[PDB]
Design a protein around this ligand. Structure first.
Ligand code: HEM
Ligand code: HEM
Ligand SMILES: CN(C)Cc1cccc(OCc2ccc3ccc(N)nc3c2)c1
Ligand SMILES: CN(C)Cc1cccc(OCc2ccc3ccc(N)nc3c2)c1
Ligand SMILES: C[C@H](O)[C@H](O)[C@H]1CNc2nc(N)[nH]c(=O)c2N1
Ligand SMILES: C[C@H](O)[C@H](O)[C@H]1CNc2nc(N)[nH]c(=O)c2N1
Ligand SMILES: [Zn+2]
Lengths: 404, 416
């Protein structure tokens, strides 16, 4: 019926009653579980039902359900949809909806912070140039000279028979990946495609490993336009290691601000195709995935050699030893630069506290175990031993197709 | 394109479709409304015994399916021998309520059970399983003899060999054969008056049952438990394994000389003894099986889990790490050195062990073999990805599809 959920380290049991509130299908069926898949394989009454549920969530949140303001707002939404096929959110509803979307995101380990989100209303944007200005202000606010603050900027919603507002880049700050025809990639191989799009739209490329990409910004039914971010706006952290003096010589660095810009924000049936949001990094994202993934910067063997490890055999655990030191260098370097960062132990501990808050608040918390457990030191963190239930609640952040 | 799950490897960018899941005839725990993939023991993965024999319709359909699988495996599907075996099973069930497997069917069935196990990273080895037929066993003393022979064969003085020994199946109006212990080799867990546990806290309940049944307990951290063996409709009997049969490896570290002084050790043979082997509707409640260890099982889980031996802080203190702050990564540093000690010690002792990198690399090869052979491979990502260094292994970047195929190894309730 409702899932019984166990923590194997503590022996404690909870029951998730919240999942009964999900109205959207995931990929699993009783025949087979597709929980480890990264992406999904793929009128008026529906919109109105999603709108009413959301308006109901909103008036409940301010302890005013059943108030006359509640009923009048439901009548406004209904009148707008019945007449125009769509409707519009008040700013206060948008703020609430953006926070709920973060709270509802099953793959985010940072949700203890969900109530602390600066929401920028950019819905009065009519051009790519205007989008750029809003983006620069977001970056400035969020960066805050290294004292990072979570934020989201919301551009105009999707509308019928009109193109979307889109940011083509997957994050506001990304490093170029240049495909040298002799196979290799200089820079970040995750970004080869976006890099080439930038060049063919007129960007003069560099040839470095850490060249910050310009933004491709698209207003409805227009070709995207190219915008170089003012270098003063892009905070970056040089990587050094507390005891290995040679580490600094690797020339490694990463940017301070993780700002995802290609997700769709869905609130009350309305869809915001451009709504970039930013937090701060957990160290393993940079140290383990971005730097050590074989299909990313792939620096493991380089670091292992500098540590004089036996690279000839798996059983020497050279990969494990190198990864630890790289992760240590990330933490040390961000701490030395006074740039906000969280290690995976601290993060997972705060997530356990979040699960407990949410059990009391809502009777559950949607969580994707495969994403919540960090990519190194899995069972050394408390989340590994915690059973989790994954389901989709709205408001939500969703994936959407690339605009090209 | 095709109406089957599309499965991507994000490291290589390669795509497959699992068509094998179309053969599953048993629901897992997930629904479109919520995924329960991370649950260790959801009710859908549980079983329970029946006193009265199963509805013959239910048994016959499972039996027919398995006979069909067997005759397909030997390339004789549709043959006269295939039809005659089907008629034979149906008549057997008609007169007796159950049926019995030929020796070659049992061998095929046991191997297919392992091949089908979604939580096993060691399945590249599935075709090399020594199947010991112990279906003639009629006493706890005889079960003990078979178990000792299994242990001697499988241990092979450190050159470990995969093996399973199958005791008589569940039968209408007769008690089960059961091994009460969860593995053939386990360390005792003694609850102390302060509330803590000396030994393996995983084994507190089984330790206390052994004591209740007449075992005189030790008081060490690595005391090997006796076996509680149960023949049909009898109280379990207590058997002590002769010490020379139980191969153990003392743990040392290749460079940290003090590590040996910690007095740690682990046993060579991982031999699970409490799972149910189901083949064609027949239930083998006692069918212990053994392979060899992957190092993270010992070094990360058994030694470092907070609810197991929990040695992380002790090792980190010895390495003079800062244990007062998360960002020093002391847990990560200590864990690597413990895992290295396990690998080094087993290699020095010439006892088979596989590191987690080598194991996951071999599992990727298994996935490719199985894509060609069967059109897929049921796999539980949470269990296949190792408990340290996850994304440093190739399996982390491979999407997987999890589903239940039979023959199968299944969980069953404790006999007490
Ligand atoms: C404040 C500090 C934050 C931390 C430490 C954090 C941490 C993380 C991590 C480690 C992941 C997995 C990322 C990956 O492996 O690529 C993640 C995913 C995610 N985060 Fe958070 N996050 C934070 C803030 C935010 C904010 C402000 C939002 C939105 C308002 C957000 C929404 C999401 C979403 C939707 C995902 C899933 C992305 C996907 O499915 O691809 N996070 N977060
Ligand atoms: C040959 C070397 C083998 C290796 C390296 C290996 C490796 C592993 C590992 C690491 C696990 C996860 C266990 C845990 O985390 O507790 C596992 C699970 C499992 N293995 Fe294998 N295994 C091997 C042989 C076998 C054999 C011979 C069988 C049966 C014939 C088998 C059947 C299973 C089953 C049924 C599970 C799931 C257990 C559960 O769900 O609790 N394995 N294996
Ligand atoms: C499917 N994804 C891997 C694609 C992708 C591309 C670019 C970035 C990305 O990150 C997801 C994400 C989202 C929000 C985050 C918030 C804070 C944070 N530290 N990391 C985050 C990471 C994910
Ligand atoms: C659900 N589990 C935690 C219960 C349990 C208790 C005792 C042992 C156990 O291990 C599972 C298992 C099964 C077969 C294996 C084969 C080889 C191997 N190296 N490890 C295995 C590990 C699992
Ligand atoms: C195939 C697998 O689902 C994929 O590699 C997932 C695993 N877990 C993850 N967890 C996080 N946080 N981020 C990821 O990109 C992934 N990738
Ligand atoms: C809660 C979670 O499912 C549990 O801790 C799982 C995770 N993955 C695992 N993976 C393996 N191989 N063995 C385990 O016991 C577990 N435990
Ligand atoms: Zn699932």
């Amino acid at each position: 019926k409702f899932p019984r959920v166990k923590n194997w380290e503590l022996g404690s049991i909870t029951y998730d009653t919240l999942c009964a509130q999900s109205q959207q299908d995931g990929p699993c069926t009783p025949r087979r579980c597709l929980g480890s898949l990264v992406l999904p394989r793929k009128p008026a009454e529906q919109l109105l039902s999603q709108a009413r549920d959301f308006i109901n969530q909103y008036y409940s949140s301010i302890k005013r359900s059943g108030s006359q303001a509640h009923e009048e707002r439901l009548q406004e939404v209904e009148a707008e949809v019945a007449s125009t096929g769509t409707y519009h959110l008040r700013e206060s509803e948008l703020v609430f909806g953006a926070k709920q979307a973060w709270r509802n995101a099953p793959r985010c380990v940072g949700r203890i912070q969900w109530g602390k989100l600066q929401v920028f209303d950019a819905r009065d944007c009519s051009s790519a140039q205007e989008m750029f200005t809003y983006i620069c202000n977001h970056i400035k606010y969020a960066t805050n000279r290294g004292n990072l603050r979570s934020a989201i900027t919301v551009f105009p919603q999707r509308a019928p028979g009109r193109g979307d507002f889109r940011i083509w880049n997957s994050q506001l700050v990304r490093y170029a990946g240049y495909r040298q025809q002799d196979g290799s990639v200089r820079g970040d191989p995750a970004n080869v495609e976006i890099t080439e799009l930038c060049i063919q739209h007129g960007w003069t490329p560099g040839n470095g490993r850490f060249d910050v990409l310009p933004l491709l910004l698209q207003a409805p039914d227009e070709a995207p336009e190219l915008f170089v971010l003012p270098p003063e706006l892009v905070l970056e952290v040089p990587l050094e290691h507390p005891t290995l003096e040679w580490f600094a010589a690797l020339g490694l660095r990463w940017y301070a601000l993780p700002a995802v810009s290609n997700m769709l924000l869905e609130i009350g049936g309305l869809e915001f195709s451009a709504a970039p949001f930013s937090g701060w990094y957990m160290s393993t994202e940079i140290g383990t995935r971005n730097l050590c993934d074989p299909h990313r910067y792939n620096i493991l063997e380089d670091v292992a050699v500098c540590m004089d490890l036996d690279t000839r055999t798996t059983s020497s655990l050279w990969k494990d030893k190198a990864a630890v030191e790289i992760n240590l260098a990330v933490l040390h370097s961000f701490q030395l630069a006074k740039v906000t960062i969280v290690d995976h132990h601290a993060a997972t501990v705060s997530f356990m506290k979040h699960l407990d808050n949410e059990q009391k608040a809502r009777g559950g918390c949607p969580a994707d175990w495969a994403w919540i457990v960090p990519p190194i030191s899995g069972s050394l963190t408390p989340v590994f031993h915690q059973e989790m239930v994954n389901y989709i609640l709205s408001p939500a952040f969703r994936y959407q197709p690339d605009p090209w």
